[PDB]
Design an enzyme around this catalytic site. Sequence first.
Site, PDB file in Angstrom:
ATOM      1  N   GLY A  38      -2.726  33.612  13.264  1.00 53.68           N
ATOM      2  CA  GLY A  38      -1.718  32.669  12.868  1.00 53.68           C
ATOM      3  C   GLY A  38      -2.154  31.560  11.935  1.00 53.68           C
ATOM      4  O   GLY A  38      -1.295  30.794  11.476  1.00 53.68           O
TER       5      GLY A  38
ATOM      6  N   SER B  23      -5.630  27.248  13.994  1.00 57.38           N
ATOM      7  CA  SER B  23      -6.819  26.525  14.423  1.00 57.38           C
ATOM      8  C   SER B  23      -6.704  25.042  14.114  1.00 57.38           C
ATOM      9  O   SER B  23      -6.430  24.644  12.971  1.00 57.38           O
ATOM     10  CB  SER B  23      -8.022  27.059  13.652  1.00 57.38           C
ATOM     11  OG  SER B  23      -9.250  26.371  13.961  1.00 57.38           O
TER      12      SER B  23
ATOM     13  N   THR C  76      -9.568  31.470  21.564  1.00 55.59           N
ATOM     14  CA  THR C  76      -9.633  30.020  21.722  1.00 55.59           C
ATOM     15  C   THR C  76      -9.382  29.509  23.128  1.00 55.59           C
ATOM     16  O   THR C  76      -9.311  28.289  23.312  1.00 55.59           O
ATOM     17  CB  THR C  76      -8.642  29.308  20.793  1.00 55.59           C
ATOM     18  OG1 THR C  76      -7.298  29.653  21.188  1.00 55.59           O
ATOM     19  CG2 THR C  76      -8.902  29.693  19.337  1.00 55.59           C
TER      20      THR C  76
ATOM     21  N   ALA D   9      -6.636  29.593  24.850  1.00 57.45           N
ATOM     22  CA  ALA D   9      -5.362  28.889  24.714  1.00 57.45           C
ATOM     23  C   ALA D   9      -4.636  28.646  26.039  1.00 57.45           C
ATOM     24  O   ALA D   9      -4.683  29.497  26.938  1.00 57.45           O
ATOM     25  CB  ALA D   9      -4.442  29.662  23.761  1.00 57.45           C
TER      26      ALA D   9
ATOM     27  N   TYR E 226      -3.272  14.359  26.530  1.00 61.09           N
ATOM     28  CA  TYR E 226      -2.991  14.700  25.165  1.00 61.09           C
ATOM     29  C   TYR E 226      -2.666  13.383  24.445  1.00 61.09           C
ATOM     30  O   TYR E 226      -1.819  12.630  24.902  1.00 61.09           O
ATOM     31  CB  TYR E 226      -1.853  15.725  25.139  1.00 61.09           C
ATOM     32  CG  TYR E 226      -1.493  16.269  23.795  1.00 61.09           C
ATOM     33  CD1 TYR E 226      -2.298  17.177  23.143  1.00 61.09           C
ATOM     34  CD2 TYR E 226      -0.305  15.904  23.194  1.00 61.09           C
ATOM     35  CE1 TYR E 226      -1.961  17.670  21.888  1.00 61.09           C
ATOM     36  CE2 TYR E 226       0.060  16.389  21.956  1.00 61.09           C
ATOM     37  CZ  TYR E 226      -0.767  17.273  21.305  1.00 61.09           C
ATOM     38  OH  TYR E 226      -0.354  17.726  20.086  1.00 61.09           O
TER      39      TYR E 226
HETATM   40  C1  LIG Z   1       1.320  22.787  15.779  1.00 58.56           C
HETATM   41  C2  LIG Z   1       0.278  23.359  16.687  1.00 58.56           C
HETATM   42  C3  LIG Z   1       0.493  23.487  18.048  1.00 58.56           C
HETATM   43  C4  LIG Z   1      -0.525  24.022  18.863  1.00 58.56           C
HETATM   44  N1  LIG Z   1      -0.301  24.167  20.179  1.00 58.56           N
HETATM   45  C5  LIG Z   1      -1.220  24.677  20.981  1.00 58.56           C
HETATM   46  C6  LIG Z   1      -0.989  24.815  22.438  1.00 58.56           C
HETATM   47  O1  LIG Z   1       0.118  24.448  22.978  1.00 58.56           O
HETATM   48  N2  LIG Z   1      -2.003  25.360  23.147  1.00 58.56           N
HETATM   49  C7  LIG Z   1      -3.177  25.767  22.601  1.00 58.56           C
HETATM   50  O2  LIG Z   1      -4.102  26.268  23.292  1.00 58.56           O
HETATM   51  N3  LIG Z   1      -3.465  25.599  21.308  1.00 58.56           N
HETATM   52  C8  LIG Z   1      -2.546  25.114  20.454  1.00 58.56           C
HETATM   53  N4  LIG Z   1      -2.849  24.990  19.084  1.00 58.56           N
HETATM   54  C9  LIG Z   1      -4.154  25.497  18.615  1.00 58.56           C
HETATM   55  C10 LIG Z   1      -3.977  26.960  18.169  1.00 58.56           C
HETATM   56  O3  LIG Z   1      -2.572  27.310  17.972  1.00 58.56           O
HETATM   57  C11 LIG Z   1      -4.581  27.909  19.204  1.00 58.56           C
HETATM   58  O4  LIG Z   1      -5.994  27.682  19.384  1.00 58.56           O
HETATM   59  C12 LIG Z   1      -4.300  29.383  18.963  1.00 58.56           C
HETATM   60  O5  LIG Z   1      -4.761  30.116  20.097  1.00 58.56           O
HETATM   61  C13 LIG Z   1      -4.958  29.990  17.752  1.00 58.56           C
HETATM   62  O6  LIG Z   1      -4.230  31.176  17.443  1.00 58.56           O
HETATM   63  P1  LIG Z   1      -4.115  31.806  16.000  1.00 58.56           P
HETATM   64  O7  LIG Z   1      -3.607  33.240  16.157  1.00 58.56           O
HETATM   65  O8  LIG Z   1      -3.432  30.787  15.146  1.00 58.56           O
HETATM   66  O9  LIG Z   1      -5.667  31.787  15.654  1.00 58.56           O
HETATM   67  P2  LIG Z   1      -6.308  31.377  14.256  1.00 58.56           P
HETATM   68  O10 LIG Z   1      -6.151  29.904  13.971  1.00 58.56           O
HETATM   69  O11 LIG Z   1      -5.929  32.484  13.301  1.00 58.56           O
HETATM   70  O12 LIG Z   1      -7.848  31.636  14.631  1.00 58.56           O
HETATM   71  C14 LIG Z   1      -8.555  30.762  15.502  1.00 58.56           C
HETATM   72  C15 LIG Z   1      -9.919  31.286  15.754  1.00 58.56           C
HETATM   73  O13 LIG Z   1      -9.838  32.606  16.268  1.00 58.56           O
HETATM   74  C16 LIG Z   1     -10.476  33.585  15.464  1.00 58.56           C
HETATM   75  N5  LIG Z   1      -9.642  34.768  15.600  1.00 58.56           N
HETATM   76  C17 LIG Z   1      -8.315  34.876  15.351  1.00 58.56           C
HETATM   77  N6  LIG Z   1      -7.874  36.102  15.689  1.00 58.56           N
HETATM   78  C18 LIG Z   1      -8.918  36.816  16.146  1.00 58.56           C
HETATM   79  C19 LIG Z   1      -9.182  38.169  16.662  1.00 58.56           C
HETATM   80  N7  LIG Z   1      -8.203  39.072  16.748  1.00 58.56           N
HETATM   81  N8  LIG Z   1     -10.437  38.510  17.084  1.00 58.56           N
HETATM   82  C20 LIG Z   1     -11.426  37.622  17.017  1.00 58.56           C
HETATM   83  N9  LIG Z   1     -11.257  36.380  16.559  1.00 58.56           N
HETATM   84  C21 LIG Z   1     -10.070  35.926  16.104  1.00 58.56           C
HETATM   85  C22 LIG Z   1     -10.559  32.919  14.109  1.00 58.56           C
HETATM   86  O14 LIG Z   1     -11.723  33.323  13.431  1.00 58.56           O
HETATM   87  C23 LIG Z   1     -10.646  31.453  14.444  1.00 58.56           C
HETATM   88  O15 LIG Z   1     -11.968  31.166  14.767  1.00 58.56           O
HETATM   89  C24 LIG Z   1      -1.841  24.442  18.266  1.00 58.56           C
HETATM   90  C25 LIG Z   1      -2.010  24.343  16.905  1.00 58.56           C
HETATM   91  C26 LIG Z   1      -1.014  23.787  16.105  1.00 58.56           C
HETATM   92  C27 LIG Z   1      -1.283  23.642  14.630  1.00 58.56           C
HETATM   93  C1  LIG Z   2       1.695  16.009  15.393  1.00 58.11           C
HETATM   94  C2  LIG Z   2       0.440  15.405  14.777  1.00 58.11           C
HETATM   95  C3  LIG Z   2      -0.265  16.388  13.837  1.00 58.11           C
HETATM   96  C4  LIG Z   2      -1.011  17.465  14.602  1.00 58.11           C
HETATM   97  O1  LIG Z   2      -1.906  17.123  15.342  1.00 58.11           O
HETATM   98  N1  LIG Z   2      -0.699  18.748  14.431  1.00 58.11           N
HETATM   99  C5  LIG Z   2      -1.415  19.815  15.131  1.00 58.11           C
HETATM  100  C6  LIG Z   2      -0.956  20.047  16.582  1.00 58.11           C
HETATM  101  C7  LIG Z   2       0.398  19.954  16.923  1.00 58.11           C
HETATM  102  C8  LIG Z   2       0.847  20.173  18.230  1.00 58.11           C
HETATM  103  C9  LIG Z   2      -0.054  20.507  19.227  1.00 58.11           C
HETATM  104  N2  LIG Z   2       0.072  20.757  20.553  1.00 58.11           N
HETATM  105  C10 LIG Z   2      -1.175  21.001  20.982  1.00 58.11           C
HETATM  106  O2  LIG Z   2      -1.410  21.291  22.209  1.00 58.11           O
HETATM  107  N3  LIG Z   2      -2.160  20.926  20.049  1.00 58.11           N
HETATM  108  C11 LIG Z   2      -1.500  20.611  18.888  1.00 58.11           C
HETATM  109  C12 LIG Z   2      -1.904  20.390  17.573  1.00 58.11           C
HETATM  110  C13 LIG Z   2       0.731  14.155  13.988  1.00 58.11           C
HETATM  111  C14 LIG Z   2       1.618  14.162  12.909  1.00 58.11           C
HETATM  112  C15 LIG Z   2       1.872  12.984  12.178  1.00 58.11           C
HETATM  113  C16 LIG Z   2       1.228  11.779  12.483  1.00 58.11           C
HETATM  114  C17 LIG Z   2       0.333  11.734  13.548  1.00 58.11           C
HETATM  115  C18 LIG Z   2       0.041  12.866  14.319  1.00 58.11           C
HETATM  116  F1  LIG Z   2      -0.841  12.755  15.346  1.00 58.11           F
END
Ligand SMILES: Cc1cc2nc3c(=O)[nH]c(=O)nc-3n(C[C@H](O)[C@H](O)[C@H](O)COP(=O)(O)OP(=O)(O)OC[C@H]3O[C@@H](n4cnc5c(N)ncnc54)[C@H](O)[C@@H]3O)c2cc1C
Ligand SMILES: C[C@@H](CC(=O)NCc1ccc2[nH]c(=O)[nH]c2c1)c1ccccc1F
Lengths: 566, 542
Positions: free
Chosen positions: B143, B146, B222, B224, B462
Amino acid sequence: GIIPKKRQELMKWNGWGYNDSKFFLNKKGQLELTGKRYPLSGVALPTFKDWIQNTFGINLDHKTPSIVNEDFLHELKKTNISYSQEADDRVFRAHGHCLHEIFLLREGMFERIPDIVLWPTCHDDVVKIVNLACKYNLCIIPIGGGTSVSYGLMCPADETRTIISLDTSQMNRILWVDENNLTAHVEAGITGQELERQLKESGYCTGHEPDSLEFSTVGGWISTRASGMKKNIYGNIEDLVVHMKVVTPRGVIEKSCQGPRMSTGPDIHHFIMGSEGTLGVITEATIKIRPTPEYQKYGSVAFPNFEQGVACLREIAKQRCAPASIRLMDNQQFQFGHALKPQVSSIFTSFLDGLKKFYITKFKGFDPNQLSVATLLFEGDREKVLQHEKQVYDIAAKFGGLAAGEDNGQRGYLLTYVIAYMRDLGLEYYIIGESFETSAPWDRVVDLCRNVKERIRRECKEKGVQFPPLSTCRVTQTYDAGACIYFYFAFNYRGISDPLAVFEQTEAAAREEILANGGSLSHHHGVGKLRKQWLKESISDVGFGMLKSVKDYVDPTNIFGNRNLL
Amino acid sequence: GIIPKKRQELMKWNGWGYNDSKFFLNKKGQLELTGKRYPLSGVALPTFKDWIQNTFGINLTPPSIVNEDFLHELKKTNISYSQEADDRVFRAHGHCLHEIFLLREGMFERIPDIVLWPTCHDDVVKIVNLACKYNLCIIPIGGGTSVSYGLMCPADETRTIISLDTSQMNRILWVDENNLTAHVEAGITGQELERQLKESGYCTGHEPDSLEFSTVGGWISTRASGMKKNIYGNIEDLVVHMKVVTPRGVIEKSCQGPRMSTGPDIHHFIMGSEGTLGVITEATIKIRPTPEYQKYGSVAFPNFEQGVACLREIAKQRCAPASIRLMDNQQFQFGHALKPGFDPNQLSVATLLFEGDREKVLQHEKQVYDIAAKFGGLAAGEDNGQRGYLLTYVIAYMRDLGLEYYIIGESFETSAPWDRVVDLCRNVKERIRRECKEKGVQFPPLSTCRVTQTYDAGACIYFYFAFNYRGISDPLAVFEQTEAAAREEILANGGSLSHHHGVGKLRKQWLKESISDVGFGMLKSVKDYVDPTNIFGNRNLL
Ligand SMILES: Cc1cc2nc3c(=O)[nH]c(=O)nc-3n(C[C@H](O)[C@H](O)[C@H](O)COP(=O)(O)OP(=O)(O)OC[C@H]3O[C@@H](n4cnc5c(N)ncnc54)[C@H](O)[C@@H]3O)c2cc1C
Ligand SMILES: C[C@@H](CC(=O)NCc1ccc2[nH]c(=O)[nH]c2c1)c1ccccc1F
Ligand SMILES: Cc1cc2nc3c(=O)[nH]c(=O)nc-3n(C[C@H](O)[C@H](O)[C@H](O)COP(=O)(O)OP(=O)(O)OC[C@H]3O[C@@H](n4cnc5c(N)ncnc54)[C@H](O)[C@@H]3O)c2cc1C
Ligand SMILES: C[C@@H](CC(=O)NCc1ccc2[nH]c(=O)[nH]c2c1)c1ccccc1F
């Protein structure tokens, strides 16, 4: 509850458990357990002899040096660490509780045994011993309770180094109880019995109740991925352990903080959990605790047959409302349980006819040689427990289940701690056997049990065993994805050239059958040296090699040389 | 539901989420989100402009280096690939602030040289053999979500970098209704996995805020955590099986028993490995029937401390609902601003989500409000409850809003024991203010926290940190510094390095303290056995 250093003072040098507890024929010719340790202790079992005779066709009357370096030795004295080269201390810690081992304890002798026994009392002691073992090129085999059933403690024959049996029994304190975070930090040698006792004095318990809890230790549970009876409420050991300290040849392993859940790379606790003494000594561990339950309630349910029972347990799993413990026994185990009741039969009415009549009004339309029984234990707050009980009895009703009384329930639960004494009884009357287990997906359980039981028949017949073996099973744990199935296998070895060989081969054949029906290599017993030959296939060549890489890193000279797993 | 190969067709090249979704000023001068994708899309937020104003004091490409013998052989596989700059730049980053800047304002030191899109496990096997043969680096991406620099290409890495994009490896392979498991390819997104399963009457219930884009494989890599972990578990509870392609070969257990004792558990060697060991190609995940009913709730407390005690009590009695979150006063006022006696500045709020069968839900709900009344908690409405959970997926869109008005920030997290929670929150908050004044930030930064997960032994905390950088010489360096300092304050007050975000390359300098030298070394021994030539060269963790 503390294991004393000279164990044979309190414990059977040649089999399971306490010296004060054994089966004997009483003054009326009825089997009874000596002592006063258990609720069944000193209680006459008048139908037990008859069930044994019917089941096995026996009569029940006719019966059956220390090589050590002086510099090391001299250095070990400076430590004040208690030790012994006495043959009886060494032989006692040379085995667990697999059948072949018990026979070498009895009529025979082990090929290799520990050369010396040390009794560390703290983490720091263990550090010194491991340092000494590096310096003098010693082999170390930790032992806690000695309850292994996987050859996890056997000394490999061709080990030429001085083997230290590193006995953790004296390393056994609760170091702190954190009431805010509900955790207890303890030393790894503490037994389950002693752990619960002490915690109870503060209002707390772990609820981790393996059948060996009288002697099994915190560090052994971690080492073997132990499971307990009340896993549904409390978790298995991997859910319970929140922190640990481990001494390896390479150094101490310990995480810094006790945050409740982390994302900081692969979880190193799981590299250690299930390691079976091949990596180092677990010295201390932090374990989750709970308020002692306010109320407990036993129960039992009978189903038309085993298949109906399994489907009910499946549905209980599916609704996620399993009680603290639920176990489904097949018909043979139901009959065995009947054979321990106190009612004295007429010598002119068969076992089976008293059984039929006993359950004729009670279990209507149920076939008495087909029915199966779930035993149940609930605990927590009285009001919650009673709500949950009704829920579970209502689901079971939909599978033909009929409420079979709290008495059966309570009885099954107490009996769990006494069954292990039956080996010794069996041994005096030419009856050998062993329990074994697997876990399997829900969709394989019924076929697996049926085919495993029938594989045991076929193989016993083919090897010359004159009577069809006792071959029974029960479902001991439920999960979302499946179940733990636990089997007993037993036979009369009269007529047989080589009875241990026959047991050996038949137990292997059973494991082959288990795996072929989609079952696991082990649910909780572990691999030890008993199941090494299937490991590679079960975890993959690459998985196996990753285990070896961790072993070669933390223990490069193979100090922790039990040879379990790899 | 499938992510397209040209992702910029659908997703923002320069920020979070979908092209169709951006905040704007509507015809009545109110902020609102474009599009129709979320339930707040097209819903005016009258009071959000006021809030931004009161709070921040504002008025409102390098060439693809690649070998031709490799490329000659890639063409025989028929695996789809690109060397196009915009395909490589999309995959050069996740969602940390400094990355969002290099993406917009300038350029990354290093980006992938080629993007490959395998469609199945066997494709991935060929990619990895090709990388062994031609000595290439692979950085898997799912996705792209990261928030730990887990995707950043290391600057000094001179081998060809393949971005191994899993998004076309994205089907459900089988659904086993007997065992309630689902065997999926690892590139399936959370949204698409939940959509397909729901047609059958099932769910995983695993709901990370990133679920629209994040993938089964990313989750496993990760460790997650998801919003309803109380009912369904986190990823390590959910996963029952996996298949992993490493340079040494394929890792796969040969049976789906629910619980084993067959040595140290090898799933845990890969779970949390962050793309440093191999590619997770397939996984089996527990599924559940879709719950019948949901209800939201909220409770007001006299202060945060009472809030924390109540949640401790709820944890202690093991009667947490699907989700429970406790917000400090500043997040409570933020929520109030985003709608369509008790002290004003101290009052705190918990939002609740209950799910399962309707009558069970209502009994549970009564039990929870009862426990809460004991800590001064007052039921504060379901509408409140709902609005907070609706907002969950829009907050990520506020970054790009903020960047238009010189406001920057990031969220970050920790887990901590119950009896550290209150002091960790106060001290981490105060430590950010202090750092911001010392570095020349005109206005006191936004510095809020909430408790988002509870557990037996503690909680997930958080944090949001944001400030107007109008007037600052090097505002990214100040943020970087202030983040780093808040992590030091976290670690000093009993907090973990990460509850769920992970380590990647952002928290690497603390790992060794966290897991011990022998622990670190155990991980390196696994890496060196599995990947001796470091084909999986993202340099996360180690
Ligand atoms: C807006 C936002 C909200 C988020 N909310 C959460 C949340 O509620 N909970 C949470 O835990 N995290 C959250 N995150 C962090 C992130 O979404 C997670 O860590 C998620 O598990 C990463 O998934 P991805 O498919 O995006 O991985 P990527 O970002 O594509 O990859 C992450 C790592 O995994 C590796 N990787 C990816 N796919 C594979 C595969 N098939 N085999 C081996 N390695 C691989 C990549 O090399 C990289 O190191 C959030 C991030 C954002 C930006
Ligand atoms: C929402 C955040 C930006 C951000 O941290 N985005 C990544 C993100 C979003 C939601 C999440 N929920 C998570 O568990 N890890 C997350 C990581 C933000 C935006 C504008 C100003 C300040 C700020 F902290
Ligand atoms: C009658 C009976 C009932 C049983 N019931 C159950 C049950 O219900 N559930 C279950 O899971 N198991 C059961 N077992 C198996 C056994 O009790 C478990 O495997 C138990 O976890 C081992 O505990 P122990 O302290 O006796 O370890 P030991 O048998 O002393 O040692 C087992 C292994 O761990 C190593 N070891 C021991 N202590 C340490 C340490 N501190 N550091 C590092 N390595 C160490 C040993 O070298 C050995 O390889 C039972 C066994 C018997 C005989
Ligand atoms: C009880 C068994 C012998 C045995 O397997 N003892 C070890 C044992 C006992 C109880 C256990 N409960 C377990 O989970 N593992 C166990 C292991 C037995 C005794 C006499 C005849 C046959 C037979 F299978």
